[PDB]
Amino acid sequence: STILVIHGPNLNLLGKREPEVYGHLTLDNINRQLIAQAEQASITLDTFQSNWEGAIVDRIHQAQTEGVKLIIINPAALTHTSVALRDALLGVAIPFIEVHLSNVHAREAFRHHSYLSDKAIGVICGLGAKGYSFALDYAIEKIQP
Amino acid sequence: STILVIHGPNLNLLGKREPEVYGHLTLDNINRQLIAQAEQASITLDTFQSNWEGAIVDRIHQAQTEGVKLIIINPAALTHTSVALRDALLGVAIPFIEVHLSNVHAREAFRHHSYLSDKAIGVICGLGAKGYSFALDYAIEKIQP
Amino acid sequence: STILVIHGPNLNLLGKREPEVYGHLTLDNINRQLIAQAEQASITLDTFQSNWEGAIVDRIHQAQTEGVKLIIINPAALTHTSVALRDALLGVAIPFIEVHLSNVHAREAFRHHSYLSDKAIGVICGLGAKGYSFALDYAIEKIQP
Amino acid sequence: STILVIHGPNLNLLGKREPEVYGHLTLDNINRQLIAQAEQASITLDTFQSNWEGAIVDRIHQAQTEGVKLIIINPAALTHTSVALRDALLGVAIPFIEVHLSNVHAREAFRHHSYLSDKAIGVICGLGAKGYSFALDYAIEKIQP
Amino acid sequence: STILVIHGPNLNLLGKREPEVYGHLTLDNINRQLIAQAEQASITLDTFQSNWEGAIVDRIHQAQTEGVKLIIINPAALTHTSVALRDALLGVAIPFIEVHLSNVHAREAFRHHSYLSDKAIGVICGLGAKGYSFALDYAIEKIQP
Amino acid sequence: STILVIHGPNLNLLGKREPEVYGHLTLDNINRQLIAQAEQASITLDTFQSNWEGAIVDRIHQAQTEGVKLIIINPAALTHTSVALRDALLGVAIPFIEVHLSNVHAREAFRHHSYLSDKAIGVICGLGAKGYSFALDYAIEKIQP
Amino acid sequence: STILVIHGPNLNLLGKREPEVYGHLTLDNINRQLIAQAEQASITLDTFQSNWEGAIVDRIHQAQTEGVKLIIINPAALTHTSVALRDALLGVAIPFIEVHLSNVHAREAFRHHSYLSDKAIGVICGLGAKGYSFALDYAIEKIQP
Amino acid sequence: STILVIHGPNLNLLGKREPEVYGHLTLDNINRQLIAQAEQASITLDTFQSNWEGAIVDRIHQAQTEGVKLIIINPAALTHTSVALRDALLGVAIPFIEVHLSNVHAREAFRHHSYLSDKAIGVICGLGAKGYSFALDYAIEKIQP
Amino acid sequence: STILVIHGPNLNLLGKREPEVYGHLTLDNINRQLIAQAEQASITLDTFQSNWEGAIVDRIHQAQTEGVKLIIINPAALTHTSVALRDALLGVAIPFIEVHLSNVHAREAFRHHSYLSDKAIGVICGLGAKGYSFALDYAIEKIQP
Amino acid sequence: STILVIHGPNLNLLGKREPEVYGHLTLDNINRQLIAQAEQASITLDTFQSNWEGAIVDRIHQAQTEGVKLIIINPAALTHTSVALRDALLGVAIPFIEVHLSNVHAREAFRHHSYLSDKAIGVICGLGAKGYSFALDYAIEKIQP
Amino acid sequence: STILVIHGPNLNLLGKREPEVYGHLTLDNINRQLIAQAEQASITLDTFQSNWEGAIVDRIHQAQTEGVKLIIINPAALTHTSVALRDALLGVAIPFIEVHLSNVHAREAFRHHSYLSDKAIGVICGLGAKGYSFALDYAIEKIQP
Amino acid sequence: STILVIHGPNLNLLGKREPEVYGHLTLDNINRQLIAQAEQASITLDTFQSNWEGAIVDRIHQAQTEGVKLIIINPAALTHTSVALRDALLGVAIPFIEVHLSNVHAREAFRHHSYLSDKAIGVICGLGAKGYSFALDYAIEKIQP
């Protein structure tokens, strides 16, 4: 794949609980939208989700060998805690865009800090699912303007 | 199960090393006591331990689909570091009680901070194995008239 | 007495205001429950409440001459401010368990700090009145195994 | 206008001479792109730039009386300093998205703090001029689903 | 003239617990020594101890009334907490020397801060009961050079 | 429609020392002015002063049972140190206005923090005795518009 | 003798938005009330409002040359940010009283800090429009005792 | 002009108030001295003062188009607050020297921090008017080989 | 005797990227050198690398059951984040030496803190692969003096 | 059993400047008084002053070889800065008393911190030259009870 | 001497390593330039450099006895660490100007703090050798206007 | 010499007191081993110890003139305090390795901070005398690969 989308812990829960909390949108719905958006541009896109830090790090290492050109990553809770993730990305030297569904700055103070943002190309937060689509549009443009 | 008891990393070591250090009580002994206490009240109780953050997060997710009503969790070292665990509990919206065998406030300053305590119903620390039993007693009363 | 239960400032207000707000449970109800629980184990139990730091200190000093074996203390607001109270407990060297009705970690940041917790056997918070009962159960087992 | 795009201090330097900017892009080029994007959705869009905090505040107040439904704001340096701006936006209660051309997290530590981000719908940084277009896309969908 | 010696909370315990721990010296022994030392210089000396902050404040107010020229105070735990005590001393404008039996700098970090030390003539700590005698020697010389 | 005015520690010293220092105005003068101002509006007003935290807490608890509608409080040194006071006011749920004679912000840094101000209707400081009159004027309007 | 009342940024919005949000009182209403209050005491009073820091600073400099004796200032958001404003007031050496409509201490932590309060005669916050009337009452008594 | 001298807010007050306070020297006297010093070296020098941040930012932008080679700036209070000013200077990439009349380190702690000093060639403070002459001397020497 | 060498997350990447960046030395090369050095002293050297925290915790627990005498550990990114690792080492009570290839003090501030260093026998950083050899030399001498 | 008195940097200046600023007492006067006090108790006492840290460290090392039993040290400015001094005292394991002429707590905040006080037997400050005499009186009692 | 120039540790290295690095200017050259400048004004000027803190302190003490009227000091690294130096300058009460060749604010955070700057007449940094000449100009004018 | 070994304050005390406390190893023993190790590799090695900061700085300057290629330095206490040392090493641009006998991370929190570690090639602590040998091994390989 040329673009890899990574989702961090707890994102698998999207749309599961009381679909009038945060409605009906699922992680799969998001993935399908992105895969279709990428197919439109003849770009190959892979997706990955895990609750396990190590599985995400392993997947990043694999991305390097597969010739992934850009990573779109929503590290979820791991953005505030995982230097291992930072060092995986940097160690494979694949540029990345950081995405969060919710506005990270509007929540508790510990969510204001990120071990990834300072090394990302850019960061999108608080725009829901469309944030991932925006990241993908940017990525496509960078590769095939 | 109605009640799920979760033990974090390193709690599998209980009673393994020099049973004159901290004596002979094992994690299994704790679990047996709790299972018997729950059986006495005709409540179904399950237990889980892991050294792997992701395994705990996955287990919490599964708790939601199983209809667990309350979680009793000793996150051990993960209390001070895991936002992923916080967000797992909050994401499934299962109420929980936090338990530690030892008095966390009597140890190093980094153990005074918890990513769970502020969202727990309550917190018990420093009362050894009985802490879990107390949490269970509370839980039983909350769930049953 | 063998066991002494101390309640700090403002706890006399329990159940007084709009008993629907936090319901109907009074300080006296709590004391009666504890006195009965103690009688059931043939342990003598005394109780004390004051809004005056000095009265609490004096009472602790008296506990020493009376041969009190363990103190269960809900210092309420004094937990965050009274080094005098810490030094009274340490000076008479009577082991103690700290109890709070409400979850101190779920409130303002200044409530996260305690001049007692680090010297307590353990701490219970957020489990309402049952917290004192749990502390008593522990205490009984410790004194008369 | 339905949508108002605000550019803060020093943004007038883009392209005219490039302060330290890269791409040869100018503020007028950005505006033309957004106006055309907005026309394409039959949404009316105005733009505004100033180096003067008071002018921006006045403009926000004027937005209220004009029935503006959403503000896309690149406050530039004022994001780190201007509580007056925060209070203008909150006082008129117009929702806003915050946009920065550059990655504000990749620079000095003082740029990590914002008096706006916590109250924004969301924040986009580091994606250049496309950041504004993404905001506008989000805004269009929100206003005209 | 008149010197007043004030002892804070818990100092009444001196020599009561296991005279092995820190031995046999009592608060009354200290007071006797000081009263004799003062009598030897034909200076009138009064003493006061309380566990109650308000009593100590009242006593300081009374001091002014009695024309006390200098206060020797061991505030004990109140040194780290009582602004009321600071303001009492300042409000009557009686100069004072602060004394502690134990070395306050050699204990927990919270004991390093004092609401009195910056307004004392001087501070003596860690020299046991002699600290009070030294303070009295100084005071005598200051009042009757 | 009773109003209660509470004065904290050390306020009894007003006008006692060197009536040139802070002038001749006494606490009793302030109380007389307030009682007369309240009588002019046919509002019943009581006053209370103590050096003792517990006396103040008790007096607040009594205010509830007496049907006091608003408290005007100058906690003096206790504003920076008493959570017990905060919790007494909040526990009786009587609205209050915080007053200080002097400008608390112009003094030492530790005086800049208050355990009351965030819960007060408002705060007045630095305007001398008039501050209490202003608080009373506001209170009267609020209770009997 | 001349009193100048200065209103800072965003205060022009008063009473504009949903008059049940914060009701119907306007900045003009406030000024009318203060002008009438001043006429009643035969004091000349001027008023000023701006969203522009430099306009306010200029106005302060003009106040010096006009012989203004006292300034009543509600700096609004500038209280937390503007050292320029501090230095303008200090540079002209006109005493001032700081007023806020809302209780600044009851909001975000950054609103607890002021570049003005420590140099003000006093401060009033959280008493709404009356706060300005109180400041004027004080000012009148100070200028014409 | 080859050199531009910028004076920040409140510097227009120099020598206005009680000329035996901080003397008779005026902003004009400073400017006249600098213009004469520059004329003596056949260097063209312009000067600018404003109380309005945006005007200063605009003036810096204009300096770029006028071919200014070096800026001598006394940002006065804006040194501690204005990131806009920092980003103007950096954006036009004109080197600058920072000057203050008074010793910024000898005052309040907040004046120890600057958004400019770290990017300045150098900083002169506390040497009165001669500071600007020294900055100009330096600048002349630099604008040569 | 067995010595166990643990390599943390991302160390599997050594000598993959740009072998002129940090050259050609691989994790396997390091291990082979260590194994040969251990064989020379008739000590068994076991090695382990993982990207997964839990795997490393499990491996430490396994070390205890197999009678490992000393651990040499490069936790890599987990140094700064993993209390679980600290508690694993301490729980098994195997002595350990901490090693880093790069100079952790020369990088970002968050790399300055270690959850292991305070409990390690010692620490080596910045000496590349030779660090591990040095740790092993020390370890051999400690096991076989 | 010798006592050694150590005076730090700048103490040689005592009584040199404007003998009315701090009067006439010189370092040599202090030393003569202490030497006489010691002779009176048949204790051998040596003294030492230097402006050079290393000289003081060397002198402490020499004290060990000379069999000194107790050090009375006024480190002056070195109390706040010199870990080398701390480590010299600890390394030779000679107990010490810290003395300062002035009240170190009444000055700048940086003077509140000491690298000695926590390891001293005790500390005396603010009692002038008598402080050294008091330390000597204590020392005599400790060595010859 | 009338004016004394003091150079701190490591300044002897100027011009001694890689003259195209920091070029060819030596500490001697700086001194020769100053001595000549002083001769032009018939002012007697002495200079001093040392790597040893004590030597500098001694030299400052000597300056007092010589009747030195002003000190120009570049403390180099000692500015951030030496309270001994601060106290020497203050103890002899000779006014001083602080000079640094390089811009101390543009370097590591620890270099932003000075134990001298707050007591200096003023401070010059970042203007190379000319800084000292400026300081000397100022000093000459102050001493012989 | 090609390599220079520097030992800081108090290291001369090694093996002097209670050779059971830390045994018998002396500084001279360490130097002899290093000299022998260096001779074995045909490298010239010099050593130096002092308790005086200035002596160490002077010695470092001298190392430059002697062509020293690498410094092995145990700064002991000066690591936490001496910017002068840092600047000496940087100013001569001789690479260096930092060594401590004891584990600096296992002691007080202030020992965690170093003014050298960040500019060292690497750091070794806690491995006793062997730490110096290791540094020498590394240095030999760097200089004569």
Side-chain angles (χ1 to χ4, degrees), chain D residues 42-113:
Chain D
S42 310
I43 207 153
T44 46
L45 186 131
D46 203 5
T47 66
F48 182 83
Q49 191 272 334
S50 182
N51 298 320
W52 307 57
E53 180 183 67
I56 295 168
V57 171
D58 284 349
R59 181 70 190 84
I60 292 164
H61 291 172
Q62 291 157 9
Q64 185 181 43
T65 81
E66 298 152 357
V68 172
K69 300 298 195 236
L70 188 143
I71 288 162
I72 295 165
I73 185 166
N74 181 351
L78 298 180
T79 195
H80 318 298
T81 64
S82 182
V83 351
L85 198 52
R86 180 196 183 84
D87 292 348
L89 290 163
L90 295 179
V92 303
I94 293 170
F96 67 98
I97 301 170
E98 178 183 2
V99 176
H100 298 280
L101 298 166
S102 75
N103 185 344
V104 180
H105 307 286
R107 296 183 68 192
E108 299 86 347
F110 71 81
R111 295 186 193 270
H112 288 124
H113 168 277

Side-chain angles (χ1 to χ4, degrees), chain E:
Chain E
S1 299
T2 298
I3 303 301
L4 171 63
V5 183
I6 293 169
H7 311 280
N10 303 300
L11 287 166
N12 62 110
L13 301 174
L14 281 175
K16 310 327 201 27
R17 211 164 78 69
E18 283 176 349
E20 169 53 7
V21 166
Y22 274 163
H24 322 260
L25 201 77
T26 63
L27 191 58
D28 282 296
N29 295 337
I30 290 170
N31 286 333
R32 299 328 311 175
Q33 179 280 322
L34 294 167
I35 287 157
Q37 175 180 358
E39 278 163 353
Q40 184 129 270
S42 311
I43 283 182
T44 296
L45 185 130
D46 201 5
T47 65
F48 184 81
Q49 190 271 336
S50 183
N51 297 323
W52 307 58
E53 180 184 67
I56 296 167
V57 173
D58 285 349
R59 180 71 189 85
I60 291 166
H61 294 177
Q62 291 154 16
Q64 171 172 37
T65 206
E66 302 162 347
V68 163
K69 310 305 177 215
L70 190 144
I71 284 160
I72 296 162
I73 185 165
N74 183 348
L78 300 179
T79 195
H80 318 299
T81 65
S82 187
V83 179
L85 197 53
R86 182 195 183 84
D87 290 350
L89 291 162
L90 294 179
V92 303
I94 294 170
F96 68 96
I97 302 168
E98 180 184 0
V99 175
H100 299 276
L101 295 167
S102 74
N103 184 346
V104 295
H105 307 291
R107 300 178 68 186
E108 301 86 348
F110 70 79
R111 295 187 191 276
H112 304 179
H113 157 76
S114 176
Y115 284 112
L116 301 188
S117 301
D118 65 313
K119 296 292 181 176
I121 295 165
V123 184
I124 302 166
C125 74
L127 305 183
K130 271 179 173 298
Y132 287 100
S133 310
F134 299 150
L136 180 53
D137 177 305
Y138 186 93
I140 290 161
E141 179 58 20
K142 217 271 226 204
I143 290 157
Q144 49 170 63

Side-chain angles (χ1 to χ4, degrees), chain F residues 18-97:
Chain F
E18 294 201 87
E20 270 57 276
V21 166
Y22 282 99
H24 314 257
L25 200 77
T26 64
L27 193 58
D28 189 53
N29 294 338
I30 292 170
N31 287 333
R32 292 320 163 84
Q33 181 282 323
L34 296 167
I35 286 158
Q37 174 181 357
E39 280 161 357
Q40 281 204 176
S42 311
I43 278 272
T44 45
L45 186 131
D46 203 2
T47 65
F48 185 86
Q49 191 272 334
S50 182
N51 298 325
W52 308 59
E53 183 184 66
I56 298 167
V57 172
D58 285 351
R59 181 71 191 83
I60 294 164
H61 291 177
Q62 290 154 14
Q64 185 182 40
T65 83
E66 298 153 357
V68 170
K69 297 291 208 267
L70 189 143
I71 287 159
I72 297 162
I73 184 166
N74 181 349
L78 302 180
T79 194
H80 320 297
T81 66
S82 309
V83 178
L85 203 54
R86 184 196 180 86
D87 292 349
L89 294 161
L90 292 180
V92 303
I94 294 171
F96 67 97
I97 302 168

